[PDB]
Amino acid sequence: GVGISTGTFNNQTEFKFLENGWVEITANSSRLVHLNMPESENYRRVVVNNMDKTAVDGNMALDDIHAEIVTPWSLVDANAWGVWFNPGDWQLIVNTMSELHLVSFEQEIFNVVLKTVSEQPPTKVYNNDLTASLMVALDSNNTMPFTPAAMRSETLGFYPWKPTIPTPWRYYFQWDRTLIPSHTGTSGTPTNIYHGTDPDDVQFYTIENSVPVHLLRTGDEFATGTFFFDCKPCRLTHTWQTNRALGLPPFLNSLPQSEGATNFGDIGVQQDKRRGVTQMGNTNYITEATIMRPAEVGYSAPYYSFEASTQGPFKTPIAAGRGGAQTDENQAADGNPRYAFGRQHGKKTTTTGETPERFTYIAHQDTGRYPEGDWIQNINFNLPVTNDNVLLPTDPIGGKTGINYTNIFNTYGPLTALNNVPPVYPNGQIWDKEFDTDLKPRLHVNAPFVCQNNCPGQLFVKVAPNLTNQYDPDASANMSRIVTYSDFWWKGKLVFKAKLRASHTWNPIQQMSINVDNQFNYVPSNIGGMKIVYEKSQLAPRKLY
Amino acid sequence: GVGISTGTFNNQTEFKFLENGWVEITANSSRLVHLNMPESENYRRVVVNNMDKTAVDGNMALDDIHAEIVTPWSLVDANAWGVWFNPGDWQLIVNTMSELHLVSFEQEIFNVVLKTVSEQPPTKVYNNDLTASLMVALDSNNTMPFTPAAMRSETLGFYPWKPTIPTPWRYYFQWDRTLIPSHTGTSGTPTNIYHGTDPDDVQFYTIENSVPVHLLRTGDEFATGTFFFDCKPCRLTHTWQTNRALGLPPFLNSLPQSEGATNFGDIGVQQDKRRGVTQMGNTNYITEATIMRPAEVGYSAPYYSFEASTQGPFKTPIAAGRGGAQTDENQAADGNPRYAFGRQHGKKTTTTGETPERFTYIAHQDTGRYPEGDWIQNINFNLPVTNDNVLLPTDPIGGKTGINYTNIFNTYGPLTALNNVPPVYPNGQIWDKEFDTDLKPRLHVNAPFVCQNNCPGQLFVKVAPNLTNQYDPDASANMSRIVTYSDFWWKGKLVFKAKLRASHTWNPIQQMSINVDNQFNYVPSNIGGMKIVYEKSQLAPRKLY
Amino acid sequence: GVGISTGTFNNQTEFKFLENGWVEITANSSRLVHLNMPESENYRRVVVNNMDKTAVDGNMALDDIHAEIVTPWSLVDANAWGVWFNPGDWQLIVNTMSELHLVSFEQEIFNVVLKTVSEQPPTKVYNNDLTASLMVALDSNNTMPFTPAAMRSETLGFYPWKPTIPTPWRYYFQWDRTLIPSHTGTSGTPTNIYHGTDPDDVQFYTIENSVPVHLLRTGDEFATGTFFFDCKPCRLTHTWQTNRALGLPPFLNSLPQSEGATNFGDIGVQQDKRRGVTQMGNTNYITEATIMRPAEVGYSAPYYSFEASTQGPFKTPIAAGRGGAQTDENQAADGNPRYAFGRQHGKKTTTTGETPERFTYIAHQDTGRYPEGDWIQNINFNLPVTNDNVLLPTDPIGGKTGINYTNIFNTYGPLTALNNVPPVYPNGQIWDKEFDTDLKPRLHVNAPFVCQNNCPGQLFVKVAPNLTNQYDPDASANMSRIVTYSDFWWKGKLVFKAKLRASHTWNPIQQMSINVDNQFNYVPSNIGGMKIVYEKSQLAPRKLY
Known part of the structure; x- marks a missing residue:
């Protein structure tokens, strides 16, 4: 098996037709994975403490205290759009499909190779250790803690022609910690402590102890079976209506007679003599702001x-962000996710420095809130409103100049309508495991697809220990082993089921296109540098009501 | 039938195996019930008013005003763990099972006996009234108002060898009442009134009029059929992860080199140069506190x-309480249920006094909030935070020194993850009827099992009126009847379906055991006193994500 | 076969259900074994003599004189609980099972690798000798002397992720030796001699001559078949009753009237006027100490x-130790086994020094003796006993101040009841071969399972001699061979059949749990250190009579 390839390199994306109106998107993605021998063949319980930062009153938000089990295993994560689609393909999907269904997923590891490193210059020499093994473990039952790499931009690379690497697997370990808020001028020293561990919550997981492990030598290969999802369809459309645009508009008794941006129409009926329905039993004022609407699109938090x-x-966390003529992405706010990432996932390949590349994704869906426009009135509703009868986003709460009631406010309720998070290409996570709590969240903010019952298992990799002739288990010093490393090929098949969009309006719709401006974000540089710019996913309207 | 037993006394709990991994827990519980002739053979509409208490400004919380129909019937309630399991059995269940399913329930009343009491000493004489009857009514259709006795510690006793009694049945009757809040120094007299009844809400229920009644003489017996539940499984595991422990931990670039509680690990990357995803479109600060998490475990109320x-x-009401190194059960707070009860349900049998025994159950699940740690910042997020730009749990709301924003705060929303209430042995209620409102609660705080469609019917008991030779219906004075009372045996069969737990971690788990400390809480005294100490139910971890 | 894995790494432990009440525990354990080329390819008859130690009068106990055949073979021993179960699993077994049956055992050696070592620095180089072989021999017929490694803490390691090693096989060779006791002040020189060998007892065993040997090259693998035990079930319960707690207690004529540790009950009958049965034909004294009991639980030795x-x-050797409020593990005594071991079997991985880690296992079963309480009276039994009529553990024997009759005493007899040794996790041996003497011991002290007819055969390993171009058999100097060593994977499957325990008492039982104290004995350190603390196995009561 030594001199024989054990798999195929395929990174094509196929589109096939089904039933009237549907297509089967088959995304193939393979990559050359480079894996190094682990730092230590041991599991470590490490604590991270940065009190020196939170000690400075008013820095609570910069807290990093936490404990984590550091395993000698690596994780092969492909849960990220950038892994499966290139810009062009994404364009096609986003411009011509109306919804997306996650169908199946399958992986394979092949053409395994294990190399060894030998040694005033000092000249290095690399040879093949034909008999060495690569350890593979597929946690099919999801015994291990779920740790999506996309969350820390650590998935496989986004370029078929650029070798990549898996990530050092590690997971959270229970710990108690207390930190009291404080502002720049707080007197004394706020309680800031790391208490320790509740034995009742101690969970030390081991791959060796709960997952069967396969050893792969050059001639061997490993293939997971095909896993079938089930989760909800994801929509490639955005809604735009807000409560103000729900239902039958008021009948205008007077229409314009000539063009012009000053020639408006008029309802033509005294505001308190209008017919209709309001939820305000006090006044007879039926206004576009008081008129009753079915429910409430969006919520304040x-x-x-x-x-x-x-x-x-x-x-x-918040479900949705905010858009409109009040954003412009520099007045950005809560809700809009911000992705920071490296060269391997979109940052210009040839850029130098530790500074990452980023963007704040601003969804096309208008389902957010503009606090500055919120306000509260006294029930009496004596409509020239007195200062004492309103609470404005301008009036200070708790004597604080920068805090108003909206910062405290929450309007989530029985009438709340809402949308799931849109896909973020290419840095966004694709699917996610559901919390194992009796009552589940109505959605997740990290990914559009949430496998309910069972998700695909995590794939773990590790270079088997290549010992020297001097090994002593009974010794205290760290074992010395031959510097070994491995390179193997990974191939995946992610299958979707999508529906072609239809043209409902007379006017054309928003489509992703290449401009004179973005043009160079989709082509290599003269040095061979690349980059993958983020792209919106729900262009085009969907009538909400 | 006079000289013949009509049933069997069985109080054993059997465990039987099923399908790979499951067991059928069959809990048998029988008891000797002592029932007295009702105070009055009439139904009364009684009002309870304690204004003299709420009149003292600042005592609103001590309000007791309410109306209730007092029936001449008694209720035989067995809805409480203490009725079906003794400590040992509970131990077994809790230590070796991972989840519990409520399957079926059936009752039986047998060996009925009716005795009579006769009269300077004065010496009493007791005889058997062989022909007298005991009235039994099983409200199968749940026509009557649901009134779980566990809520007021009035279920059957918890000791197989200790006779018990049913409770005088009574139910709420509609009434209007107004009470205005006030503090110790409020001027004037706050509106405090009991208005009366809305005829549109008047509902006077009668057992005689809506439930068939069986008359039982010594030789007779009564058995309900078997009722089958359906409700959700209850979990015997607790989650511990909080938002801070969800997903892939940050990759530590610098690990410890020697043991010690001072040797921490380090992320090793400037906080604003880190890669990852946050929901804060303003800053580039990716911190363990700002990093994006799937949803939100728990909520603030x-x-x-x-x-x-x-x-x-x-x-x-609140869904969950609070635990950790910040509780210690004397800093207890909102959320943790507190059970108060008598000798028949756990208080030391031989203790004297009207003072009850109590405990505040503090669940093992970490899904609560520590308000003192909450805080709010201005969107600008200029991270040495100014006093004017934060709202701390320390800053006073409404000029009140003891009220801060967290007392008002509510973070329940679309991303809220949550767990059902854990079983409270032995005083906790087992199952509960669901509200007949169009929109139901996601859970109940009183019991883990909530029968959706239909619940087991309430069992009512009453001693038939044993008249004297002088009875006049047309008379106004209360009828005089022979002092009669009855003793009968009650037997129940509650069936569960449980799953054996498995060991996932390397480390052992929390198990209930007998110490040198609790040792004497499970054995009778030299006088024969007993007590049943409360026990936690979800020991052991469950990975939440 | 060179570039192809020949086996699977599996270290999971499965629990499966059978017949009502039973489970099939399947413990899988695999490990990476590192084996070195033998010191000498020859068998040696070596004598060990340490007279310089026993020469010091009063040091007899430190005698080490013995002869042993040193073989060029290594032994792969897995006979130790630590090899098959991690703490968690052990917890589960011990807390929920009542008895354990040893069912089957099978091994496998795969992914064999043979490496070679080459040479002012001096820089070492390691290569693969693809054609080299690893010799394997499975003594199925138990021709070779039985040598359980657990006895000297030399079994395989206890950590799935830590490579291990086999032990240099060697066995006892007959020799005559005389050593006369002596105390610190003995005059002269006590006979201390090593006589030699009785040819009639000479037994020089050779693996080559009585076991078929397999040669394994990288591509080869070796699997023993499945071996089925038969031996007695081992109990996971402890008895507590002693002769003083056997049978019907005396009837108390006077019971306490109020709580208190001073309010005792009273038999209420003059000691010599009581009814009952004693085995003392002299007196009429029927006391809890003289009353007749069925037989005798335990024995004095x-x-x-x-x-x-x-x-x-x-x-x-003694069958059982001693427990109670008289031990506290520092007044420990004869009977309680003491295990001393290294880093590979439980000692903190990161600890330095030649000093081993240890513990003295103190079983939960109360079946021992407290000599200080023993005593002997003259048959006349004139119950104010005279000094001349009793022999106390205080009275000196042979004029020695520190020796009393109990040191000589033996009460083993026809009425002796007794229990088998309990399992010692993780350092204890699991099964053991029975002596081939016509009359066998009623139990062994080293392991709970003793295969009667046949036991699993010992597995021997050895690196085949890798000669250089200069080899001369006819030469006297030790052969020079290429420094070779091998690493191979070992996998085992040990199967048990256990019975789930049931709750018989009202009170809960003793269960193994994780505390705030032991918490850190089940989790790795920040350096990656580990340790495996010993655990008791028979928690929980068993009624003995």
Whole structure:
């Protein structure tokens, strides 16, 4: 098996037709994976503490205290759009499909190779250790803690012609921690402590102990079977209507007689003599702002809110962001996800420096809130409103000049309508495991697809220990082993089922196209540099009501 | 039938195996029930008013005003763990099972006996009234108002060898009531009124009028059929991860080199140069507190909040409590249920006094909040935070020194993940009827099992009126009847379906055991006193993500 | 076969259900074994003599004189709990099972690798000798002397992720030796001699001559078949009753009237007027100490007794140890086994030094003796006993101040009841071969399972001699061969059949759990250190009578 290839390199994406209106998108992605011998063949329980940062009053948000089990295993994560589609393909999908269904996923590891490194210059020499093995483990039952790499931009690379690497697997380990908020001028020293561990929550997982491990020599290969998802379809359309645009508009008794941006129409009926339905039993004022609407599209939630439980503070997450003529991406706010990433996932290949590349994804769906426009009135509703009868986003709460009621506000309720997060190409995660809590979240913010019952298992890799002639188990010093490393090929097949979009309006729709401006974001440089710019996914309208 | 037993006394709990991995827990429980002749053979509409208490400004919370129909019937309630399992059995279940399914329930009343009491000493004489009857009614269709006795510690006893009694059945009757909040120094007299009844809400139920009644003489017996539940499985595991422990931990670029509690690991990357995903479109700060998480485990809700509707104030309920190194059960707070009970349900049998025994159950699941750690920042997020740009749990709301924003705060939303309440042995209720509202609660706080469509019917008991030779219906004075009372045996069969737990981690888990400390809580005293100490139910971890 | 893996790495432990109440525990354990080229390709008859130690009068116990055949073969021993179960699994077994049956055992050697070592620095170079072989021999017929490695803490390692090694095989060779006891002040020189060998007892075994040997090259693998045990079930329960707690207790004529540790009950009958049965035909005294009991639980045996035969002195072994409020593990005594071991079997991985880690296992079963409480009276039994009529553990024997009759005493007899040794996790041996003497021991002290007819054969390993171009058989100097060594994977499958325990008492039982104290004995350190703490196996009661 030594001199024989054990697989095929395929990175094509096929489109096939089904039933009237549907297509089967088959995305193939293979890559050359380079894996190094682990730092230590041991599992470590490491604690990370950065009090020197949170010690400075008013820096609570920069807290990093946490414990983690550092395993000698690596994780092969492909859960990220960038792994399966190139710009062009994404364009096609996004411009011509209306919805996407996640169907099946399957992996394969082949053409395994294990090399060895030998030694005033000092000249290095590399040879093949034909008999050495590469350890592979597929956690089919999801015994291990779920750790999507996309969250830290550590998935496989996004370029078929650029070798990549798996990530050092590690997972959270329970720990108690207390940190009290403080501002620049707080007196004294706020309680800031790392208490330790609740034995009742201790969970030390081991791959060796709960997953069968395969040893692969050059001639061997490993293939997972095909896994079938089930999860909800993801939509490639965005809604735009807000409560103000739901239902039958008021009948205009007076229409314009000549063109012009000043020639408006008029309802033509005294505001308190209008017919209709409102949810305000006080007034007879039927206005576009008081008129009753079926339910409420979107919701208001506390912004830049940090809650805390047994392990420290964390940002209260939001379902949707905000768009419109009030954003312009520099007045960005809460809700809009911001992705930071490296050369392997989109940063210009030839750029230097530790500084990453980033972007704040601003979805096309208008389902957010503009706090500055919120306000609260007294029930009496004596409509020239008095200062004492309103609470404006301008009036200070708790005597703080920079905090107003909207920062505290929450309007989530029985009438809340809402949309799932849109796909973020190419840095976004594709699917995600559901929480194993009795009551589940109505959606996740990290990925559009959430496998309910079971998700595909995590694939773990590790170079088998290549010992020297001097090995002593009974010794305390770290074992010395031949510097070994491995390179193997990985191939995946992710299958979707999509529906072709139809033209409902008279006017054309928003489509992704190449301009005179973006043109160079889709072609290599004269040095061979590349980059993959983020792309929106729900261009085009969907009537919401 | 007079001299013949009509049933069997069985209080054993059997475990049987099924399908690979499952067991059928069959809990048998029988008891000797002592029932007295009702105070009055009539139904009464009684009002309870304690304004003299709420009159003292700042005592609103002590309000007891309410109306209730007092029936001449008694209720035989067995809905409480203490009725079906003794400590040992509970131990076994809790230590070796991972989940519990409620399967079926059936009752039986047998060996009925009716005795009579006769009369300077004065010496009493007791005889058997062979022809007297015991009235039994099984509300199969749940026509009657659901009134779980566990809520007021009035279920059957918890000791197989200790006779018990049913409880005087009574149910709520509609009434309007207004009570305005006030503090120690409020001026004037706050509106405090009991308005009366909305005829449109009047519902006077009668057992005689809607349930068939069986008369039982000594020789007779009564058995309900077997009822089959359907409800959700209850879990015997607790989650511990919080948002801070979800997903792939940050990759540490620098690991410790020697043991020690001071030798921490380090991420090794400037906080604003890190790669990853946050939901904060402003900063480039990717911190363990700002990093994006799938959804939000747990939620924040207003604490020691009392809302009011047409019948008075009531405490706003919470789903989960709080644990950790910040509790210690004397800093206890909102969320943790507190059970108060008598000698028949766990209080030391030989203790004297009207004072009950109690405990505040503190679940093992870490899904609560530590308000003191919460805080809110201005969107600009200029991370040495200014006092004017944060709202701390320390800053006063409404000029009140003891009220901060967290008391008002609510973070329940689309991303909220959550767990059902854990079983509370032995005082906790087992199953509960679901509200007949169009939209139902995602769970109940009183019991882990909530029968959706139909629940087992309530069992009502009553001693038939044993008249004297002088009875006048046309008379106004209360009828005089022979002092009669009855003793009968009750037997129940509650069936569960449980799954054996498996060992996933390398480390052992939390198990319930007998110590040198608790040792005497499971054995009788030299006088024969007993007690049943509460026990946690979800020991052991469950990975949440 | 060169570039092809020949096996699978599996270290999972599965639990499967059978018949009502039973489970099939399947423990899989694989490991990477590192084996070196033997010191000498020859068999040596070596004598060990340490008279310089025993020469010091009163040091007899430190005798080490013995002869042994040193073979060029290594032994792969897996007979030790630590090899098959991790703490968690052990917990599960011990907490939920009542008895354990040893069912089958099977091994396999795969992914064999043979490496070679080459040479002012001096820089070493390692290459693969593809054509070199690894010799394997499975003594199926148990021709070779049985040598369980657990006895000297030389089994395979206890960590799936830590490479291990086999042990240099060697066995006892007959020799005569005489050593006379002596104390610190003995005059003269006590006979201390090593006589030699009785040709009539000479047994020089050779693997080559009585076991077929397989040669394995990289591509080859070797698998033993499945071996089926038969031996007795081992119990996971401990008895606690002693003769004093057997049968019907005396009837108390006077019971306590109020709680208190001073309020005792009273038999209420003059000790010599009581009814019952005693085995003392003299007195009419029927006391809890003289009352007749069915037989005798436990036995008394001479302590720190050393007997001697043809090869020297040896400690007289005891069946059971001692527990209670008189131990506290520092007043430990005869009977309790003490295990000493290294880093590979439980000692903290990162600890330095030649000093081993140890513990003295103190079984939960109360079946031992407290000599200080023993005593002997004259048959006349004139119950204010005279000094001349009793022999106390205080009275000196042979004029020695530190020796009393109990040191000589032995109460083993026809009425002796007794229990088998409990499992010692993780350092204890699992099964053991039975002595081939016409009359066998009622149990062994080293392991709970003793295969009667036939045991699994010992697995021997050895690196085939890799000669250089200069080899001369006819030469006297030790042959020079290429420095070769091998690494191979070992996999085993040990199958048990266990029974789930049931809850018989009202009170809960003793269960193994993780505390705030032991918590860190089940998790790796920040350096990656580990340790495996010993654990008791028979927690929980078993009624003995």
